[PDB]
């Protein structure tokens, strides 16, 4: 990552998250609604959270909402499909900086102290997603 930070973001259901999380290991994804291999690769996202494999692993998603339409689109289409993982709106663009982000999907295993374990670009499963738990 670019810089050692953290992010202090509020959710689009309105939780408030942080990444990497407090004493836990986090779980960073990236994607947009149009995009090809994230929309069929989202309900894997939602079927590994509503699982729940691991308390000790967090699942925070982030949205690059400067590549969608607007924002309201983002809103329609997580309201319409359902999605309920947590979603964070990249609206500042300091994450997708902040991870060099050029493709997508892309996902990090991260540890405690934000240094990134996994790296993944291209689409995932519910299985490797609690792979990446385990």
Do not use: R
Not at 3 to 8: N, T
Not at 30 to 36: G, I
Not at 59 to 70: A, D, G, R
């Amino acid at each position: 990552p670019a810089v050692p930070a953290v992010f202090l973001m509020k959710t689009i259901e309105g939780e408030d998250i942080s990444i990497p999380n407090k004493g836990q290991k986090t779980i960073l994804h990236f994607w947009t609604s149009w995009c090809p291999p994230c929309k069929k690769e989202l309900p894997q996202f939602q079927s590994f959270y509503d699982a729940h494999p691991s308390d000790s692993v967090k699942l925070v998603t982030v949205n690059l909402v400067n590549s969608e339409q607007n924002q309201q689109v983002v809103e329609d289409f997580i309201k319409a499909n359902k999605l309920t993982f947590p979603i964070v709106l990249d609206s500042k663009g300091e994450l997708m900086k902040e991870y060099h982000i050029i493709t997508i999907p892309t996902s990090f295993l991260l540890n405690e102290k934000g240094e990134i374990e996994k790296t993944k670009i291209g689409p995932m499963t519910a299985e490797q997603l609690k792979e990446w738990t385990e």
